Structure formats: C-alpha cells, structure tokens
Ligand binder design. Structure first.
Ligand SMILES: Cc1ncc(COP(=O)(O)O)c(CNCC(=O)O)c1O
Ligand SMILES: Cc1ncc(COP(=O)(O)O)c(CNCC(=O)O)c1O
Ligand SMILES: Cc1ncc(COP(=O)(O)O)c(CNCC(=O)O)c1O
Ligand SMILES: Cc1ncc(COP(=O)(O)O)c(CNCC(=O)O)c1O
Lengths: 460, 463, 460, 463
C-alpha cells in the first residue's frame, strides 16, 4: 500500500529525516559562529534560497526558450528569459552586442562548455598558472606531465605566470609565450590574483597571435556588476563566470558572448551565440536546473540594486583595511596591497608554510586556505562573506588582530616543537592559548547578523 | 550611499524581494498540479527533499572528498556527504566492500561524462544504444551528415547499436557483431525510451568477448532498481551511473557507482575504479560540490529505502502496464507490444500521425507527453507513469488517463482529416475548438482530485 | 692522408667489399634457380636497374619541378616531369583531369601521405579487412584493440569484409557499415583479393555516406596499365600505387589525384593537387630519391609498350591456367577462380594450415606466403614474377604439378607425425622425397631466361 | 601479339631502352663534376655503393626483421641486413649489448617519424631546434599564422627552441626554461644549419630535469661522428636517428639507433626501445624494406670504418674552417663567427643582400649554395664542404672556392647598386653579363682539375 502523499511528500524535513535536519542545523551554527575568509565563499539571501528550494526542480526543459524539445515550459521560459535579461542588465550590456546562456550547472561546466563551443579537441589554450594565481579549469598538468584538468586532457594548455619578484602578471613574458606557442584561446581572470587585469593588453596580445580572448570573472563578478573593477566586457570575446562568489547568488555559471557586427579589423559578425548555446545543450548538459535559474534571476535583480553597489565598494575597502592592518604589523602581501576582494599573504618571510597557519586558524573557526605565491608559502584571505554579514572597516581591522594572534601562536608552536609538520601537530593538542582565541572568535562572530535564515529560530 | 541592512536584503522573503519570480513560481506550481504530467523523466519530489535543497548548504565550498578536502570548515559537510554515500549503497543493496559511489556529479550528463573521463583516454571507442532506438545523447550521437552532436562523440569515438527493426527489442546478435568489428573500450546499456528490461548478463557476455568495460546508465529506472522491481545492473556491470531526479524521486543530481575489491578471474588483482572516478569528478571536471543537492539527495535516498517507496515502484509499473493494456485495447500500437518498466512507447505511424501533432494538441489540454522516435519526424510519443503515480494515481486512474489520451488522438485525427496533413493546415484546427476546451477542462477536473507533494495546495497563490 | 678518389670512389664493388659482392651474387642465383610465386614480387629490367644505380642518388632536390628550394635541378626537373607525364600516359589519363606525384619512397608512404592530405588526425577510414584480403596500410587493429597500422594509430579505421561463404566483397554489408560508421575515406583495393573490383559500386556507396574514395592498386597496377582489369580512375578521387609489383618497375609509390572541374553533383573544382603535393613535401618526406624517379620513368615507358600489354594478358592467363590446374586436382580456390594476377588456395578442406605448406615449399625453392581466407588456412600464389621470366600456360601448369607434389608430401608428413607444428617439423629433417622435388624445381627453373642481369656472367 | 623476349626488354642496356633518360642522366653526370657543389647535405658516393644500389636486391620482398620474416626465401637478405646492422654499430663504436640499430627507414624523415611513433602517443609534446635557428622540418614546424606544416606538428604537439639572438649559439638557459613550462615527452637535438657542436651532456641534464626522452638526429654530421671528430651523441642520448647520404657518404637511407640493456639509476630495469622501434618501422609505418639500399648502406658503413674515411672527415672540417677564415678575412660575417663542423653559415644582411640574390647568381656560375635563415627573406646562405672534399679538395682549393664566392658576391652587389634592390630590378643584371661568364668559366676550369667518385669521367657521353 502506497504512503499517502501527505505522509512522505508534504511532511517537513525535521520529521522525514532528523539526521540530515540536525546536520544542516549544525552547519547553520558553524556558518555564523566563525569567521569565514575563503575568498570564493559568500552568504546568499533568503529569497535566493526560496527560489532554490522550489517546485522548479521538478521540471524538465531541455533546450532553451522558444526552442524546447517538449511542452509545458510556458512559465520556465519567462523565468529563463527574465534571468537572461537581468544578467545583461547587471553588467550594463547592450543586448544587440551581448548574449548570455544561464544554463551551466556551475563554474567549471561553464568554462568547459565555452571551450567546447569555440575550440576543437587538442587546440592550444593559455591560462594563468595555478601557482601564479590561476584556476584548475584554465589548464593544469604536473611536473611529471600528468594531465589533471580536463582542459589539459582534452585540449593542450600552457600557463603564463606572474613576475617572479613583483607578483604582477608578466605581460611581456605573456606576449612572448603566446607567439612561440600560438594558442587559439587565451584565458584571463583568476582565483588568487590580488590586482586588477589589463584587459586592453590581453586584447593587444590576442590580436597579435590570432587568439580568442576569454575572461573568467568568477571571483570578481560582483565587483564588475558594481563597476568597481575593470570591465572585461570591453575587450574580451567571451566572459564566463560563477554566480555564487562575489555575486552572492546560487551556485551556477553563466557564459556571456559577443553578438552583432565585428569592430572593423571584412564586414562580418560574431558567430558565438549558436555555438555557445549548442555546446551547453545538446552537447554537454542535460535538462537545465530550473530552480538554480530562478534563484539566479533573484540574485541578478538583487545585484543590480543601489544597496549592492555599496556592498561591492565595502568589500574592496574591507580587504584594503585588513591589508593595511597586516602590513602595519610587518607582514608581507603579494604585490603589497590589493585592488579587489582578497589579499594574498606571503608567509615565507616568517619561515612558515600556508598549511600550518590554515590548520591553526581552522582550529579557531577562522577558515582560510593555503595558497601558492609567485609547500604553499601563503594564505588567501577574502572579504565578501564577512562583508555580507555587515562587517565594515573597524571590524576587518579586528579580524586582522585575530589573524595576527593566530600567526604568533603558530610561530610560538614552531619555535617550540620544530619546522616539520609532524612536530607542529604536537603543539596543537590541548593548547590553552588556541582555546582562548577560539572563544574570542566565537564571541566576535556572534555580534553580527546573518542572511539566508533567521538566527532567532535555529535549533542551536 | 550605505549598505543595505542584512534583514532587508538577506532575510526578507522571496515574495517581497522579487514579486516577478515569486509570481512565476506560483504560476508554475499551478501548472504542475492542474494538468497531467506524463514525461517519463519527470517526478514530483518530497517537501523534505526541497527543504534540504533550499538550505544554507549552498554557501559552503568543499572541493575534494570527505576526509581529504582542500580547506577546512567541512566537519558537517563530510558527515552529510558520507551519510549520503552510505545511503546510496543501502538503497541499491550493495556490499560496501564490493561497491563505492561518488555523489558529486551536478547532474546525469556530468556523471556520465565524468565516468568516461575516468576510464577512457580521449578518442577511445564507445558503444551505446542509438538515439533513434531509445538511447541517450550522452551515450554518443552524430547525425547522418557526419555532425558530431554529443560531447561523447566529440571527445571520444562512438558507434551506436540498434533495436530489431521489426520487434523493437535490442538486437543482441547485432550488438555482438558490431562490438567485435569496432572493439569499443566501453559498452553502455540503459536508455531514455526503451520499454523493456535489459539483459545485463548478455551485455556482460559481449563485453567479456570483445574486452570492453560495461557501464549501465540507469537514470530512468533507478527507482525501479532501488525497489528490486527490474533486473539489477550491479550483478554484471563494472560502473553504474545514474540520475537521481527521475523514478528515484530525488533532487536533480547524479551518482557514479564503481566496483571495488577483488575480481573473479590477472592474479588476485583488484578493481582500480575508485581513484580514477573520484579524481575525474574532482579535480578534473567539477569544482566545488553542490552541497544542498547532496543533502537533498541524502534525504531522497533514505526515503527511497522505505517500504512505501517499494510500493510506489510497484505501482508505477502496474500503472504503466494498465495504461498500455488500455491503449492497445482501443486498437493502438506500442513498441514491443507493451512494457516492463515505467513507460510506454506509442507508435503513431499506424494512424498516419506524427508525434509532433499529438504532443502539440495534448499540451493544449494540459497533458504533457513528448514526441519520440520509434525503431524506424518522430513517429511516436513517449509516456511515463512516475510523476502521476507520485500523486496517488492507481490503475483505475491511469485507465482514465488512457481515456483522455484516446480523446486527444481522436481530436487530432478529426483535425487532420478536416484541415490536412500539412502542419500549416493542422494548426488551423486548434483555434477556438470547444471540443478541445471540454477536454482541457475534463483534464483539469480529474487533476484536482489528487494530492501533490513538495508544497501545500492549500497555501498556493493561484487556486 | 686521404685515399685517392680512384681507390675508394671508383673501385668496383667486387673489390671494395667482397662480402657484400658475394651475398648479392648468391641472391642472384637464388632468384633464378627457384620458383618465385610471391604475388607482390616481380623481376625488373636491366635498364630500370641502371637508372636505379646512377649518379642521380647524389642530388638533393627538395620541393618539386619549378618550385625547388635551391638550384642545380635543371636536369632532375626534366626527369621528374618526364616521369609524371609517362605516369599519366601509362594509365590513359587526360592531364587536365588527373595529376600524379611520383616522390613517395614506396607504397606505404604513398598511402600515408594521401591520408595526410585529405584527412585530419582521427578521421574515420574504412578499408578491406586484412583477413578478407586487405593491406596493413588500410587499417588494422587486433582483437585486443592494439593499434598496429599507423593508419589505425593516427586515424580511426573500421574494416569491411568479404562474404563469409562466397569470398567476394560483401557490397551490402559494406554499405551498411559505411552508414553506421560514416567514414571520411573509403579505401578499395587489396593484397590477396583474387577478383576484380566494382568501383562503380564503391562510388555508389561513397556518395551515399559523403566519403572520399581512394583505390590502392599496388598489386594490379600493371594489369590496369594494359586495360586488363577495371580502371579505378573512372570512379575514384585518388589512386595510390606501388611501382614494383605487376608494374615491374623500381620500389616506389605514386599518388594520382583528380584535377579540373567536378562532375556536376555547385560549379566547383577538385582541390586535391596542392594538398597531395604538400603532404608529400614538406609535410612527410625529405628529398626525393631521384635515382628511384629516373628508374620509374624507365619503367613507365616500358609499361606503355605493346610488349607489356602482352605481358599483362599473359600474367592473367598463367594464373587462370594454374588455377584450373589445381581445381582439376580437387583443390579449393577462394571464389573458385581468378580474374587477376593471383590465386588464393584454401587449405582447410585438406586439413592443412598455410604455415605448413609454405615451409615445405620454401624447402624446395618454391616461395609462396601463408595468407588468410574469409592459423591462416591458405596460401597466396601469384603469376607476375615467373611470367616476366617468360613462362607461359604449359609452364604454369607444370608449376601446378610442383605445388600438387608439395601438398601431397605435406599431407604424407602430417599423416605420419601429427597435426601440431612441433610434429610437422619432425618430418622435414633429411626427407629424401623433399630433396627429389628441390632438384626437380632447380632443373625446371634453369630452363628460363632472367631479366635484370646476365645469367651468363654471374659468379655462380 | 606476343610477349617481348626477356633479352629484349629485360637485359638490354638503359642507353637503348630509353635514350631520353640515359641522355638526362649523362647531362646530370656532367653538371655534378663541371661545377662546385656546396650544398651541405650533398655528397658523392662511391661506385661500390652505387653497384649495390643498382642490383637485383630490388626484387626481393622481405617484410619483417632478420630471423622473423613474413615469408621465406630470405637466406641471403638476412645476412646482408645483419651485416649492415653489425657494421652500423662498428662505424660508431657502440657496444652491441648497449645499442641496437634498425636500418630499414627509407630515408631520414621516415626514420624520424618512425622513431616518434615508437616512443610517443599521438599529440605528445616534442621540442626541437627551431627552423629559423638551424633546425629541421621533421623536428616540428608551424608558421606564425598557425599553419601546421611538418608532419611532426600535425600528429604531435611541437614547440621550438632557439639560438641566442645575438651570438647564434643554442640558448641552453632558455631551452631549460621552455622544457620546464611545456614538459615535452621528447627533446630533439641536431640540425641542418647549425655551425657549432652540441652539448649533449647539457641536453641530457635538461631532459633529466623535465623527464623527457632525448633523441639526437645526427644526419648532417654522421660522417664526422663515425670518425670521432665531433661530440658523440651516444654518450647521452636514448635514441639517435640519422640519414646515411650526407657526411656519411652512403646511399639515401636512414637508421635508428636505440639504447638497450641496463640503465644506470626503477630497480634493475632495462631499456625497452628495441621492440617498439622495429615494430614502428614494420609493420606500423613501412612495407617491404628496400634491400638494394640496405646493401649499398652496408658498403658505405664498411668504407666509413676505413682509415681513409677518418682522414676524409678531418679534411672536411679543415676545409670548412679554411673557407670560413678566408671569408672572414675578406670582411664577411659568419653566424657564431666560424665553424666546428662541416659547414659555414654566412650572414649576408650586413651587405644588404638576401640569400635569394646570392644563391641565384651563384647557380649561374655553377656554384650551388642554398639560401638559409639566420638567428633573426632568408638573410644568409649555407655552405658545406663534404661534397667537394670527396673530390679531393684540400685547404688551398677551398680558399680558391672562397675566392670564387667573393667574386660572386661582388658581382651581386655591383648588380644591386646598378639596377636596385627589387628582385625585378636584380634580374636585369644577369642577362649577357660577360663578367659572370668569365666566372662561370673560371669555375668550370677549376672544377675539372679534380677527380670524381661514382662513375668514370673517361666514360661519360658529354666531355
Ligand atoms: C538515460 C539518461 N541518462 C542520463 C540523462 C541525463 O540527465 P541530466 O539531464 O541530469 O543531465 C538522461 C536525461 N533524461 C532526459 C529524458 O529522458 O527526458 C537520460 O534519459
Ligand atoms: C576563477 C575561477 N573560475 C571558476 C571556478 C569554478 O567554480 P565551480 O566550483 O562552480 O565549478 C573557480 C572556483 N573557485 C574555487 C576557489 O577559489 O576556492 C574559480 O576560482
Ligand atoms: C638534420 C636533418 N635530419 C633529417 C633530414 C631528412 O633527410 P631525408 O631527406 O632523407 O628525409 C635532413 C634533410 N637534410 C636536408 C638539408 O639539410 O638540405 C636533415 O637536414
Ligand atoms: C595492396 C598494397 N598496397 C600497398 C602495399 C605497400 O607496399 P610497400 O612495401 O612498397 O610499402 C602493399 C604491399 N604488398 C606486400 C605483399 O602483398 O606481399 C600492398 O599489397
């Protein structure tokens, strides 16, 4: 005998599965009694979450608006079209010059879909090296020559690097490598680069070697929407992005592509739109995740607001303020500052590896990540998440105090037990000094609001 | 200018922050329960799944595997994901020493393309059930004119096998013939519109004869598999990929199962799938997992192990059967003459109709079917029972669905005979057709008599 | 102190290196005191050999006539142009409709060069299966899936087969496989197919699936020159060939390609010529072997002669006569006859493998090769070489006697020692019956003239 | 109609069977010895090599390896080929337990492309000396515009390294930098117009640092290598490919050498090259061996181990040096300022001339050089000593060659200044130029004073 629809289909989660209910509540507390400094993380809005957990997940809508494989998409179409037009509006794009596909399941899929549209297998790609701040999806093989990223498995990648002493992109060595190697695609954009991008220069290099130019703006998408950093849309043929980082929406990706007539350089037009959409479906993805697309549409509307431009401005200023704080304490920052949402902290001068600081920090509910510079010798630290919780400059200056205390403890433990990791671990067991910091982090964290859910009704 | 307070942008309900989207979701809530959904790939998932899906799990970055993440703060995400992985084994009755699972694929197509990347180099050969015979795009697809459509045919080398051109069953003899000519590294079984069960043992026989891996993509029938109501592919397959949002009734995600442990006989060797598969998902293809999806999936998998889910699985079968026997009783033709799973494939060419015309008119009566190919424009339509069975429909109610479809096809032929075969002509008969209106209205009245999972009809804006 | 030019540069081979001199003399005797039935072998003319061993080997002439990379090619150019025009004349081709490149070093290179001109790596190719009579260069992988032929390593090949009971090409299963698999290139022509080729049908199949059609006529090239078999030039886009088989020239290859306007099927022309020449040089080969090209030009002139049409006619008739002889003794021929230079002898009916007959035959200076049918169950037997020595029908009927005696001895040994190869070997040691046959072969072989050198001045 | 008798078609000499070709060979015999051949890749081989080359060895089919042929009748071909293989090891002083050789390549480019197929999968990465810096097409070559020209760049993934842009030497630091960015599976050393020796130990250092195989293509300097007059690549390279018709003075063929036996230190492992290389030649790429070439090569290899060949090798070096020092003494510029092998590379841009104009005028005086690139139309010409040294020329005679070239370049500038830089203009000065005639005639008079290998001048038709 079948369970009545009420019993299995309508009963709240807290009853259907306490185990998972209880774990979600514990993660809810973790997100708001710690200090979240992972530069790729944010806290999204309750509205976005409601769209995300909606009946839109039940619908199959392979294809795209007006070219669907089967019917019943009368309202999905308005949602997707509404999502696409808000995407253009949030980045101030004329619709006669740009289009967007909002179906990619996430960032990595968007990237691989766009490659598939414009490149044949084994075509050459250049992206920012991982160790110089790049991303897996831009290409990565190891020193042994094992191909790690699918970009490196299905295409041929070669990375360009930052200057070995300044930490800035080396635009001359870039140009040099593009002309030896002759990539069909140059990727700009990164995961841990703390400075803005000279897209005009990348366009100078791409025209010199015959390449397409793609920007992957996942990290700074929110800053781009507020016109708070250089717009890659002025110079690139394609822009990919994530929607859950500085943009503060759901986890999803977007591909923006040029349309209309070519800037004279004959009398032809761009041919990206059909190749891009087709690469997404039917080539690479199945049915779009329409709950994600609804949520994104909500996030794109929020992202166009005056309140969101102030958020973007405040993200940059918080990162600067934390940056100037660390430097005033003697600490080294890659490029000696920041122009975007993150700072890159160089720990080799102190004799420390990124692993050791990130472990002790994690012990105090400060989440950072180890990260390469120029074992990883640094940590990446971002402003968006905590800024979304309403922290301003005085507050990030205090986060800086917390970090400074962590590294001190880290040096004191290294000074007492040794440089090897087996030795560093020995001084984490029942450290009364680490405890005192975890408590001070928790009390500081509880002074702030939290978007997405109500802290006044959570189980813990 | 100042920052918006957290309560204003971040806690305010969706209905205030964005009326337009709230409105459109409410309209689509109405469409889902005032019509008849018969897309074989569609289901209606539980409110408990949707609560996990719309949750704060979407803020966490957890690149990696439980226990081996890239950065910290994953104490509870590792628990949710491990719970999910252990429940995926339970729901399909797998010994934890012979099978593992990766639950990170964003969807079904990502799970397939990751599975291939793990066990194949680029351009390796693949065989899957042809699209025209009931297969799926991710199993390989180029057109007559040579154009490579599926990613699987772009980065690997595919060649399809077909059903018997007169009976509609998989032609197992011709499968073996092609696999020995072509020598694929991977054979795929499973499909999107195949109305019979699969002979996995036979597929294992062919894979062992030509030296291929055997992968079953069980997306469509995964819920029937969990309930042990169809043949299990785990008895014979090396890898089993699946979607979780069809007959499984979960969120939109995918999973990849792999054999692990010792192999029956090249000396005491063991399966090596585990590492290559997890690594193919991350870091090779995917980025951060979608943790809300993994929590929602963990919910669905627990629900999928409950005694009521077995009853649900039996019922979708019986509902598909009853509808099949009802249609044939009215004189219609079904590919292979019936069904043994969740769907029926309806051959319309005997009526001189295209699946196009039937799908269009049905949609105008709130009946969602999709046009579909038959062994030989699409000459059929595909019809599935999971969704409507999830709303409580039993056999008597699917015989009423069959009566509606009959009325629909009768409307279609009366339009064809009146205006012509041309699709220009056909559409003329769909304007102001009071006979269609009475059917759309008879459909909506039937539809309202049954409950609805996921939300509360008593709370909807449009009643 | 340098050796004078006379001492090292002009001294005859018999003095500079007796070892090699002596081995060449022993191979000279072997070629004219045996019975050479390898269908791919011939005996070429003294004139061709003189061109082959000429000062033309010292010249570097990268490029082609009138487009050379450097000078001094005033006479090489006339030789190559003379070679190309004789190539067209020997196969009755209008020069406004066909061109030829005569630079490929041999057959396999010609084939791989032509693939390279018209296909991209991994494009799909269909060729006659090896076991059905095809050639390595048309595509070959093993049952384990190891790629053997470079055609299978750098492109994707799938073989079409002969009918499992008649041994003829299965033109219906051919068409079926081309439409599933969709090759960009279909190869026709073979190494051991004893019947003519329905090129019109192959053209019907290639137009149905969008493929180029190439014929590899290496084995029957001489028969084509005499218009003694169907011309592939009526129906194919490209024809490759060897020049040392039935054509009786030096070891080298040629690529013929269509030129001029397309047969209407708009108003465009063929684009093979530049791609083909470019694939040969600079893509695949270095300097052409100008001694080979001189020799080929000599062979092409000989190949146009009335004496050579009679040779081609006589090759076919000899193979028929040997064919009808074996069959009159009860033996099975694949397709029950032959229309070209070879017969394929099916030995499974007698309970024998091709290995065993070819070993005993080799013991009597009868050279044949084991070969697959439909361990290999057959032997391939060709007429050209012995026909070039002037054997006519009565003489090949006698060769048939020799073969019949060999198989009898082979059955008698199998009947006495066993079916396994370890057992068959046991009865080859000091077999007085095999000796009597080797002697009868030698005395028969000495009754005939020999081209290429003078038997009246050889060391042995 | 009847068959021509064997004596008529098959035994009649070339001069009767085909006057046209006989005539043209005789004219080309005359060109070869009444001019000055300075193509660095050209030589004049011995009559004994040519007798093996034009022999009945061309009738035999011997697909396979000695001992492991496809069909019989190869008793003496296996002996010739084994003799040839053993002499190839002797001529380069290789221990038979550490090195093997395959002598079946039809030419140099086939030997290279077979070597790659044996040790690399398709699309694996390769680094070779750039064309513009002195490398060879088979080492990889795409143009600025992206066009893939070399087969090596079509089926594999190549990237060139370059000479130092001011000194002309290989830039070993930038080589190491690129190889660590690009991670090739194979590094190639050797070239076609590099005037210095190679630092194989350095190349081995880079290959070991980035984990690549190291192959030396020694085509140009193989004769100098056999004579131990330049650095041996066998000390450091895994595989050594070569042509046999340049400084080696053999027929047109190639060879591939491979290391075999134990490797110095991943535990007591051994080299695995032998099988993959022979199999790559046959059956993967080539068909029947050209046995006349293998016999002719066996002759050249014996001759190449004689004491006179060492004296010849020393002399080509000294001849190239003397010509280099003579040219510089007249004010000319040589890339890297001299030579340590068989050739000089002459930078003409300092005179405002293109290699085109010099090569054209030289050809009109029976002086064969080839235009060639320099570190930065080709701005240089390449000039080689092997050929003319083979005719007995020593230093005094190469200083006379230098005097002729000087006269040639002086004629060229006097034409440039008179008519202009335009190649339209330039050609105007080449018609009825009695100063060129006196130089063409002074050249032909010089040329006749020296003997000639391969044939007998006293027997030629055109004297
Ligand atoms: C058999 C099969 N496998 C995989 C997938 C991929 O699912 P995703 O959309 O999650 O990528 C599908 C899609 N099923 C679509 C249909 O039959 O209507 C499928 O039918
Ligand atoms: C620059 C960039 N591009 C794309 C992505 C892909 O995102 P998905 O997880 O949605 O696939 C990332 C991930 N950024 C992860 C981090 O920096 O921690 C990224 O940093
Ligand atoms: C270094 C090098 N390697 C290989 C080859 C190939 O040789 P084949 O032509 O046999 O394929 C050449 C040709 N040398 C031509 C020149 O330098 O003028 C070469 O210079
Ligand atoms: C049909 C065919 N095509 C091409 C070739 C290549 O020839 P080369 O050896 O010149 O590469 C062969 C060799 N025929 C060999 C045999 O049948 O014994 C052949 O049979």
């Amino acid at each position: 005998h079948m369970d009545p629809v009420s019993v299995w289909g309508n009963t709240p989660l807290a009853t259907v599965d306490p185990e998972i209910h209880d774990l979600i509540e514990k993660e809810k507390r973790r997100q708001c009694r710690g200090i979240e400094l992972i530069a790729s993380e944010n806290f999204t809005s309750f509205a976005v979450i409601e769209a995300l957990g909606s009946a839109l997940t039940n619908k199959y809508s392979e294809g795209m608006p007006g070219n669907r494989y089967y019917g019943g998409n009368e309202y999905i179409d308005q949602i997707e079209n509404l999502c696409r037009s808000r995407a253009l509006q949030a980045f101030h794009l004329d619709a006669q010059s740009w289009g967007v596909n909002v179906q990619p399941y996430s960032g990595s899929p968007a990237n691989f879909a766009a490659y598939t549209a414009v490149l044949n297998p084994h075509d050459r790609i250049m992206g920012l090296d991982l160790r110089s701040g790049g991303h897996l999806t831009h290409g990565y093989y190891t020193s042994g020559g094992k191909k790690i990223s699918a970009t490196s498995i299905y295409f041929e990648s070669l990375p360009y690097k930052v200057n070995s002493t300044t930490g800035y992109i080396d635009y001359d060595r870039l140009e040099e490598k593009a002309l030896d190697f002759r990539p069909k695609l140059i990727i700009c954009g990164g995961s841990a680069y703390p400075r803005d991008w000279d897209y005009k220069r990348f366009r100078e290099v791409a025209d010199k070697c015959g390449a397409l130019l793609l920007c992957d703006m996942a990290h700074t998408s929110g800053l781009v929407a507020a016109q708070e950093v250089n717009s890659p849309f002025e110079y690139c043929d394609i822009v990919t992005t994530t929607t859950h980082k500085s943009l503060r929406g759901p986890r999803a990706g977007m591909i923006f592509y040029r349309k209309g007539p070519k800037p004279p350089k004959e009398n032809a037009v761009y041919d990206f739109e059909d190749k891009i959409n087709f690469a997404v479906f039917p080539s690479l993805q199945g049915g779009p995740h329409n709950h994600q697309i609804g949520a994104l549409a909500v996030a794109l509307k929020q992202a166009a607001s005056p309140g969101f431009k102030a958020y973007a401005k405040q993200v940059k200023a918080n990162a600067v303020a934390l940056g100037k704080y660390l430097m005033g304490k003697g600490y080294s920052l890659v490029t000696g500052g920041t122009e975007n949402h993150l700072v890159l902290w160089d720990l080799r001068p102190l004799g420390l590896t990124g692993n050791k600081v990130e472990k002790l920090c994690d012990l105090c509910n400060i989440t950072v990540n180890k990260n390469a510079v120029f074992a990883p010798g640094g940590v990446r630290i971002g402003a968006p998440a905590m800024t979304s919780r309403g922290l301003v400059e005085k507050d990030f200056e205090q986060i800086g105090e917390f970090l400074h205390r962590a590294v001190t403890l880290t040096l004191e433990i290294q000074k007492e037990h040794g440089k090897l990791l087996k030795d560093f671990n020995k001084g984490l067991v029942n450290n009364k000094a680490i405890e005192d910091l975890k408590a001070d982090v928790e009390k500081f964290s509880a002074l702030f609001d939290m978007p997405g859910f109500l802290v006044s009704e959570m189980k813990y």
